[PDB]
Amino acid sequence: YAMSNVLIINAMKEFAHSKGALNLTLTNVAADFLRESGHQVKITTVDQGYDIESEIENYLWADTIIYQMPAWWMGEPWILKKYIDEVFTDGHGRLYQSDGRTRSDATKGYGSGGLIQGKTYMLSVTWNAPREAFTDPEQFFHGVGVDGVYLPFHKANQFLGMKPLPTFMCNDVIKQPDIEGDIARYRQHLAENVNS
Template identity: 30%
Template sequence: MHVLYVYAHPEPRSFNGAIRDTAMTTLVRAGHEVKVSNLYVMKFKAVLDPHDFRIRYNSDRFDPAAEQVHGFRTGSLAPDISEEIEKVSWADLIIFQFPIWWSHMPAILKGWIDRVFVQGFAFDPESGNVYERGLLRGKKAMIVATFGSSEEKDSHGGTDRTLTDHISSINHSVFEFTGMTALPPFIVFSTDTMNHEEGARQIDRYRRFLESL
């Protein structure tokens, strides 16, 4: 399988760094071809703005969706977006790995989605190309996320109840909307209070999870 691994954590020696390393060796050992978008290392630009479009559709008034459609059709998107679009086109499976920050993905990853899943490439509502007719149909996508808080807090209606709701929302509104099949997420809770042994157990659980893909 062609796997694109989109990774958003600024510190290689973090827990996220450790599980990313495990993913690389496990996926390659299982015979998959892997490409990585390591967003902090790439210093990936996180904001969709007029600089994303080398030839403007309308230079008087900035309409992001119209510019995306035009930019993709005319091949005039910024080079960093085009490179990511090529990787997405190549991939059978896209894995997004990130820590939960303020109940959501880090801004750099949200920016990747804003800028790379452009209208006309990933979906096209005007031609009905959304959900089962989404333009990324046939591909799979999966979230790997780490939470500082505990699973109990999340599942028993505590203040963090919305944490896994956010994961479901990405699965539906991003992956399924663009036609991809959302695979079950891999989630690690309580990372902020986890000891070394528990960390090693979670890494081993992730390795087995990836082997079962």
């Protein structure tokens, strides 16, 4: 005997042709909308630094983890890979227990040794690439979709026991900025997938 607890991990970074403003904006849009909607929200700003232990506790507290990030060389910026390499690993015993296999039947069960089953996660990504690069079979990603491109990132999260919510993506963000459209679409996405 409110709404779901949400942790937003903002992986914005000012570097070369990325200035981090779109990712900061979408982080704030989600935080404000979700809070308005009744969710408690915590925000981690990766590039600013973080306390590994606190982050592990944040995952345990969260019902849903949103990764807000730009696309850097087809995936997460290095700062976010460092964050999971530190946080997930140090989370051994609390976020996951094992690889889910037995030495007895070693070919089976990989990825079933998580401890945070029940929690969900969602990718919110920003790309210079057009949406068609992911869906047109003759284009760069051979039709595998955004979730095919992010398959290893998805699987790192699923190894802990989590399941994904549908991915949100903004495309052509450099050549054809559409902040108003991004915000409207994102609010709609959050209303459908994160609010319940």
